[PDB]
Amino acid sequence: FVIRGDEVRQIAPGQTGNIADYNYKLPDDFTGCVIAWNSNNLDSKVGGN
Amino acid sequence: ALGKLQDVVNQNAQALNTLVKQLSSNFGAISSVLNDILSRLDPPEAEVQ
């Protein structure tokens, strides 16, 4: 998926927020890896993406 | 004279009291009441205490 930078912290176990509560929630016993990379050159438009 | 019996009683009773009093100890938790912790903290935070 795609989020904003400030919401990157929300994608992690034991997190609360708009993204965590309403969009994507991870379990407390989650086992895996989260990889977030900037996509400004891809998901940004002059008129607003 | 009856102390041998009375003593016994007290011992047992004492233990129970101690046991019950152990329900009112923090043990390092923020509070000694489970309901208070549940109501004041989210599960991810509450479970720690």
UniProtKB/Swiss-Prot annotation, chain A:
Domain of life: Viruses
Effect of residue 9 to S: In strain: Omicron/BA.2, Omicron/BA.2.12.1, Omicron/BA.2.75, Omicron/BA.4, Omicron/BA.5, Omicron/BQ.1.1, Omicron/XBB.1.5, Omicron/EG.5.1
Region (Integrin-binding motif): 4-6
Job of this protein: Attaches the virion to the cell membrane by interacting with host receptor, initiating the infection. The major receptor is host ACE2. When S2/S2' has been cleaved, binding to the receptor triggers direct fusion at the cell membrane. When S2/S2' has not been cleaved, binding to the receptor results in internalization of the virus by endocytosis using host TFRC and GRM2 and leading to fusion of the virion membrane with the host endosomal membrane. Alternatively, may use NRP1/NRP2 and integrin as entry receptors.
Subunit structure: Binds to host ACE2. RBD also interacts with the N-linked glycan on 'Asn-90' of ACE2. Cleavage of S generates a polybasic C-terminal sequence on S1 that binds to host Neuropilin-1 (NRP1) and Neuropilin-2 (NRP2) receptors. Interacts with host integrin alpha-5/beta-1 (ITGA5:ITGB1) and with ACE2 in complex with integrin alpha-5/beta-1 (ITGA5:ITGB1). May interact via cytoplasmic c-terminus with M protein. May interact (via N-terminus) with host bilirubin and biliverdin, thereby preventing antibody binding to the SARS-CoV-2 spike NTD via an allosteric mechanism.
Record protein name field: Spike protein S1
Name of the gene: S
Residues of the full protein shown: 400 to 448 of 1273
